[PDB]
Design an enzyme around this catalytic site. Structure first.
Site, PDB file in Angstrom:
ATOM      1  N   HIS B  28       1.299 -13.527  32.461  1.00  0.00           N
ATOM      2  CA  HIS B  28      -0.131 -13.478  32.750  1.00  0.00           C
ATOM      3  C   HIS B  28      -0.940 -14.516  31.981  1.00  0.00           C
ATOM      4  O   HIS B  28      -2.056 -14.837  32.404  1.00  0.00           O
ATOM      5  CB  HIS B  28      -0.677 -12.084  32.440  1.00  0.00           C
ATOM      6  CG  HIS B  28       0.314 -10.983  32.658  1.00  0.00           C
ATOM      7  ND1 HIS B  28       0.952 -10.781  33.864  1.00  0.00           N
ATOM      8  CD2 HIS B  28       0.782 -10.028  31.821  1.00  0.00           C
ATOM      9  CE1 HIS B  28       1.767  -9.747  33.761  1.00  0.00           C
ATOM     10  NE2 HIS B  28       1.683  -9.272  32.531  1.00  0.00           N
ATOM     11  N   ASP B  50      10.163  -9.728  33.203  1.00  0.00           N
ATOM     12  CA  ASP B  50       9.775 -10.801  32.278  1.00  0.00           C
ATOM     13  C   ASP B  50      10.998 -11.461  31.630  1.00  0.00           C
ATOM     14  O   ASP B  50      11.217 -11.398  30.418  1.00  0.00           O
ATOM     15  CB  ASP B  50       8.793 -10.289  31.214  1.00  0.00           C
ATOM     16  CG  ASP B  50       8.079 -11.415  30.495  1.00  0.00           C
ATOM     17  OD1 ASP B  50       7.884 -12.482  31.114  1.00  0.00           O
ATOM     18  OD2 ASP B  50       7.724 -11.239  29.311  1.00  0.00           O
ATOM     19  N   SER B 102      -1.986  -9.769  24.302  1.00  0.00           N
ATOM     20  CA  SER B 102      -0.724  -9.533  24.985  1.00  0.00           C
ATOM     21  C   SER B 102       0.436 -10.177  24.233  1.00  0.00           C
ATOM     22  O   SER B 102       0.271 -11.145  23.484  1.00  0.00           O
ATOM     23  CB  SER B 102      -0.773 -10.075  26.413  1.00  0.00           C
ATOM     24  OG  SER B 102       0.442  -9.823  27.095  1.00  0.00           O
TER      25      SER B 102
END
Lengths: 49, 151
Positions: B28, B50, B102
């Site tokens: 992201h 991921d 994140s």
């Protein structure tokens, strides 16, 4: 000519077998991967819970 | 722990974590890692699990060990505080849960990383974190609660 000519007049038995194998060759490979695409989506859904 | 952040236009909008053998980065966020050794790595895009590439050489591998199975629901370590849930993530208070946080790992009492945060900005008085983990046998899963915006 006393007779009449149609579309499937010249198609022989050996020639009709080739166009039903080549059609069946694509249909065998398409449903092989389409089943296997949804198979791993079932395992990935079942991996979480 | 060693956790190199991600720079974009001078500000920090994400963090990149390193586990044993492999290098993690959230999809992201966009930007370049500050480690010039990590910039030459050919990171590849993947699904929600991921997957990236650990193409680092031998001299610095195994920075930390990922947490194995038999997960208790007791105390766990976190950079901004503590979390105390195994099936879910704990309702951590405010401050943590803003923007650009994140990729921060969640460690155990022995220094073993258990989860990596990806979302869950704010869900009222109780905030739930959308993380990735291993469910039972080490298979990487992704748990996402309802209304989890990318955080």
């Amino acid at each position: 000519a006393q007779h009449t000519e149609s579309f499937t007049s010249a198609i022989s038995a050996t020639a009709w077998s080739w166009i039903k194998v080549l059609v069946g060759g694509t249909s065998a490979f398409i449903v092989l991967g389409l089943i296997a695409t949804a198979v791993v989506a079932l395992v990935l859904f079942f991996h979480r819970h | 722990d060693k956790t190199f952040p991600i720079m974009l236009n001078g500000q920090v909008n994400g963090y990149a974590c390193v586990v044993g053998g492999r290098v993690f980065k959230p999809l992201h966020v966009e930007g370049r890692i500050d480690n010039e050794q990590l910039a030459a790595i050919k990171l590849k895009k993947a699904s929600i699990y991921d997957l990236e590439y650990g193409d680092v050489p031998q001299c610095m591998k195994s920075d930390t060990l990922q947490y194995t199975s038999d997960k208790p629901p007791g105390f766990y370590n976190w950079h901004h505080g503590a979390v105390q849930y195994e099936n879910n993530r704990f309702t951590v208070p405010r401050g943590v849960g803003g923007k650009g946080d994140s990729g921060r790992p969640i460690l155990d009492n022995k220094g073993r990383v258990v989860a990596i945060v990806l979302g869950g900005v704010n869900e009222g008085s109780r905030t739930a974190l959308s993380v990735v983990t291993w469910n039972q046998k080490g298979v990487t899963v992704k748990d996402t609660p309802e209304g989890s915006e990318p955080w």
